[PDB]
């Protein structure tokens, strides 16, 4: 009847399983409210992704317009002159780790290169303004990507935590409780009942012996 631990029913094991049940119950509640915090942050991050999608689209089209305006300034398109400047990167995603709601989320932090910015040093003066607009756009997109990475990591962590909590609620606790119920209510009661029967049989033997002795004494007093 139900899942069972198949354990040795004794008072020591009864206490052990009561402690295990209490620990599992408090762990279930503990992980439940941990998962509540994590899913609250998860919903927040989903909202940030949802609106930042259109925000980043707008910023991308602004950057594209700025680059094309620089191209208009410099006659022909920036094209291969810009492409040949891939030798060094002026913007990069610095490594970081922010403990969001107790989970070590790997939120990358955008950090433009402060050592060299010569990729835009060519042609017309508007190249600097175009580079600045594209750098702001890259920062916005890097923030969006960091939020997406946080969303993915939080989804994984929340799925694992909710799975563990559901397992504790449905299998771990719902098997420890029947195991404890078996142990105490069935086996300890049967052992106490057998002790009761044996001691009552002992008392019956003792009383019949003493009653026979009393009857013999009364008879020899009469005689």
């Amino acid at each position: 009847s139900g899942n069972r631990e198949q354990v040795f029913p004794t008072r020591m094991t009864l206490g052990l399983m009561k402690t295990k049940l209490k620990g599992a119950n408090q762990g279930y509640s503990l992980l439940k409210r941990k998962s509540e915090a994590l899913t609250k942050r998860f919903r927040d991050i989903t909202k940030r992704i949802d609106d930042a999608k259109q925000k980043m689209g707008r910023v991308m089209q602004t950057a594209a317009f700025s680059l094309a305006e620089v191209s208009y300034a410099t006659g022909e398109n920036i094209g291969y002159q810009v492409q040949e400047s891939v030798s060094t990167a002026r913007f990069k995603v610095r490594a970081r780790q922010e403990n969001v709601s107790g989970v070590y989320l790997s939120q990358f932090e955008s950090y433009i290169d402060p050592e060299i910015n010569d990729f835009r040093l060519t042609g017309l003066g508007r190249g600097g303004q175009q580079v600045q607009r594209a750098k702001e756009i890259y920062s916005r997109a890097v923030e969006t990507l960091v939020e997406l990475a946080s969303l993915q990591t939080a989804f994984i962590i929340l799925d694992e935590v909710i799975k563990v909590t559901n397992r504790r609620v449905n299998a771990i606790e719902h098997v420890i409780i029947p195991r404890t119920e078996n142990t105490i209510a069935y086996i300890n009661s049967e052992l106490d009942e057998l002790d009761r029967e044996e001691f009552y049989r002992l008392k019956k033997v003792q009383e019949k012996k003493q009653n026979e002795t009393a009857k013999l004494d009364a008879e020899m007093k009469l005689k």
Binding site: Q26, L30, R33, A37, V100, S101, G102, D192, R196, K203
Partner: protein, 228 residues
């Protein structure tokens, strides 16, 4: 209890009765029962001691014609620290409420190590009021219980979501629990605090919280005591 009955109901005194080590009395009762060749009941204890514990406990209360009264504070050691044991179970049947002494609080150096979350006075509401201590007694007790439970839960989350991930109420609750357990519950073995001194210490503990979420205190009492 015969002496207490005499004093309270014939001399008209208010008598407090402390029956310490009720578990030792239960062990003695079991020994006496097995001396009469009775077969032991649950957990070796004879099955009729609910009656005997009832006779001991019910020799209390205040009565119609006598100005005296008997208040009992039995003290029993739970063997192996469980309520399911016959002695605490029967005492809970017969007595109003219980005070809990916690081993976890004792190991932390808190005296008295009274764990207030499980402890309950069923008819506490009759001991507190306007002409009975102070008008704020009940709601201050309720607020202390609520904030202490919230502090314990927030202490659980302190090691699971981190200190900074807690809500502002939880950050207040950690330090409220700290101050509570080691200044208010922690009382010297010879420190006699009157009910009003304890009440205003409780108020000083509750003055850290804001108006909005001291929600279990009546707004009249809260607006008359918390704001100065």
């Amino acid at each position: 209890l015969t002496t207490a009955e005499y004093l309270a109901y014939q001399t008209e005194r208010h008598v407090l009765t402390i029956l310490t080590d009720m578990s030792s009395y239960a062990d003695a009762l079991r020994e006496v029962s097995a001396a009469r060749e009775e077969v032991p009941g649950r957990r070796g204890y004879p099955g009729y001691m609910y009656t005997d514990l009832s006779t001991i406990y019910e020799r209390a209360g205040r009565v119609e014609g006598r100005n005296g009264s008997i208040t009992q504070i039995p003290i029993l050691t739970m063997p192996n620290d469980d309520i399911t044991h016959p002695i605490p179970d029967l005492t809970g049947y017969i007595t109003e409420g219980q005070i809990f002494v916690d081993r976890q609080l004792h190991n932390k150096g808190i005296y008295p190590p009274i764990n207030v979350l499980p402890s309950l006075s069923r008819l506490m509401k009759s001991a507190i009021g306007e002409g009975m201590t102070r008008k704020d007694h009940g709601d201050v007790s309720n607020q202390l219980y609520a904030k202490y439970a919230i502090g314990k839960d927030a202490a659980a989350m302190k090691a699971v979501v981190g200190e900074e991930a807690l809500s502002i109420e939880d950050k207040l609750s950690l330090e409220f629990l700290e101050k509570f357990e080691k200044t208010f519950i922690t009382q010297g073995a010879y420190e006699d605090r009157t009910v009003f001194e304890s009440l205003d210490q409780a108020w000083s503990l509750l003055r850290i919280y804001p108006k909005e979420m001291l929600n279990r205190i009546s707004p009249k009492i809260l607006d008359e005591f918390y704001d100065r």
